Amino acid sequence: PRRTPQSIPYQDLPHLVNADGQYLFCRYWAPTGTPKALIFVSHGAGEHSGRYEELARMLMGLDLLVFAHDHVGHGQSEGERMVVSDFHVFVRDVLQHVDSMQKDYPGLPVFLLGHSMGGAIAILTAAERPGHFAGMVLISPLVLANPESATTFKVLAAKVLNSVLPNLSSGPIDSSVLSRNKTEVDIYNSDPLICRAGLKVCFGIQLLNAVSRVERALPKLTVPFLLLQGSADRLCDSKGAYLLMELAKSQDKTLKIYEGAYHVLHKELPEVTNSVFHEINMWVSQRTA
């Protein structure tokens, strides 16, 4: 029988088979009553859906049915770790899961929540289905990568794109730039389901594709969104958040800047994280009443 990369049979776990025949591990948090809306949680590179337990439980407490899967190559889903044939695979698979849930739960509004790479996936998902999503919550979405990281990575990308170098990777990122909360950093460094290895160059190329595709999608984006961004973000440059606010056509767009905060706002210092949870709670509550 088919098993996760951690040797657990998929028959023992919630799952979905994607269009490429790959098993995706799924998570669900459903309220005891009739849901007011559905919301898909889109995780970022290297991590997995289990990192969203507390946010998901908050949203479920608002009577939303929260659902997620581990993207291909991540967590408990299948696929060579941190490989993707094309970035759109992630978007396609989100859409499959959304479409499946909308059948089981017809007539409900559907929201997207995405962090980091998962925020770029959310943007591209909404841009593919204009008018279909009720709203998007973006936590430091990948709109522009760190300019310094992008420049040096593009040099590595040149080698892989001009030669046959299938194993080339970037150096690992220093986990301390992910959050000022050292306990959250230590937890991230301890989770066996998180891939903390240096980025394979082929995957980083797909992140460059994500950035290019987000740029082209902005003038089409009309979905309501809440955008949360730290001013000291070394992964997704804050300039991308300002550009998203300026270039999206959405009539309902709000930006909250957390001064001094690092990339992972929902795992930051308690004052930041508590505010992040409260702001998402209010924004979703106002749009599901």
Ligand X SMILES: O=C(c1ccc2nc(-c3cnccc3C3CCCC3)oc2c1)N1CC2(CC(n3cnc(C4CC4)n3)C2)C1
Q: What is the CA radius of gyration of the chain?
A: 18
Nearest to 25 by CA among 100, 79, 86: 79
How many angstroms separate the Cα of 99 from the Cα of each of 27, 70, 86, 189, 217?
16, 17, 21, 34, 21
Active-site residue flag, 263: yes
How many angstroms separate the Cα of 104 from the Cα of each of 90, 99, 108?
22, 9, 10
Q: Which of residues 216-235 bind ligand X (CB under 6 A)?
A: 235
Under the binding rule (CB under 6 A), the answer on residue 44 touching ligand X is yes
Under the binding rule (CB under 6 A), the answer on residue 45 touching ligand X is yes
Q: What are phi and psi of 25, to 5 degrees?
A: -75, 135
Q: Which of 60, 68, 137, 207 binds ligand X (CB under 6 A)?
A: 207
Residue at 98: amino acid letter: V
Stretch that binds ligand X, among 28-36, 56-64, 81-89, 184-192 (CB under 6 A): 184-192
Closer residue to ligand X in complex, CB, 52/133? 52
Q: Which residue has the tokens 């007011």?
A: 36
Q: Which of 47, 70, 78, 233 binds ligand X (CB under 6 A)?
A: 47
The CB-of-142 to ligand X minimum distance in angstroms stands at 5
Closer residue to ligand X in complex, CB, 46/230? 46
Active-site residue flag, 116: yes
Active-site residue flag, 63: no
Under the binding rule (CB under 6 A), the answer on residue 188 touching ligand X is yes
Under the binding rule (CB under 6 A), the answer on residue 168 touching ligand X is no
How many angstroms separate the Cα of 70 from the Cα of each of 61, 78, 268?
22, 9, 22
Determine contact, residues 82/45, Cβ cutoff 8 Å. Answer: yes
Closer residue to ligand X in complex, CB, 182/249? 182
Two tokens, residue 178:
């992910």
Residue tagged active-site, from 15, 74, 115, 263: 263
The CB-of-20 to ligand X minimum distance in angstroms stands at 21
Stretch that binds ligand X, among 15-23, 67-75, 143-151, 215-223 (CB under 6 A): 143-151
Residue tagged active-site, from 49, 77, 116, 179: 116
Q: Which of 22, 96, 102, 149 binds ligand X (CB under 6 A)?
A: 149
Closer residue to ligand X in complex, CB, 76/288? 76
How many angstroms separate the Cα of 49 from the Cα of each of 45, 197, 214, 250?
11, 18, 22, 27
